[PDB]
Amino acid sequence: KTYVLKLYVAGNTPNSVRALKTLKNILEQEFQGIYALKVIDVLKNPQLAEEDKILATPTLSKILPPPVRKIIGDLSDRERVLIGLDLLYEELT
Template sequence: MSPRKTYILKLYVAGNTPNSMRALKTLKDILETEFKGVYALKVIDVLKNPQLAEEDKILATPTLAKILPPPVRRIIGDLSDRQRVLIGLDLLFEELSGDKTDMLHSGPEEAI
């Protein structure tokens, strides 16, 4: 049995706006359905931490970045289309071929 991949993602939002909350809810729904137990999500508010947005070259929100496993992938804007998110992050193939049994539980997302 091969070791499970852990998916490290960052969601950049601008404050507690309806658009930011919708992006977070949609993303959490996708992750809990498809990658429960094998992901870590860090939510970064660029209004509170503009230096992080600058360091990571984030120009618009919401921006979702898949950091691990490589390669790094980003989606900017609307996250409501589940298939677009999975394809854009290069996760669709793994989602369709992965074994979803015996997964570890993920911890809560970390807000910065």
């Protein structure tokens, strides 16, 4: 049973790619096995699949860890590439 953190972005900028890498390592170092990360670029895969949804970053980021919330804030308020998020809690192989 794992949390799948999904970030929906509108393209990438140099800082966003850097921020995402930082987010990845953080999850890997500080939360190994607790969060799986998935980044969906709507510029490459615009159509949401039937069971997908994009919710507002403010609402969902509230239960994420502080250092994760901070990078998400940058993707959102500074880089302006983060449209939203989805958070899943399901069994993963």
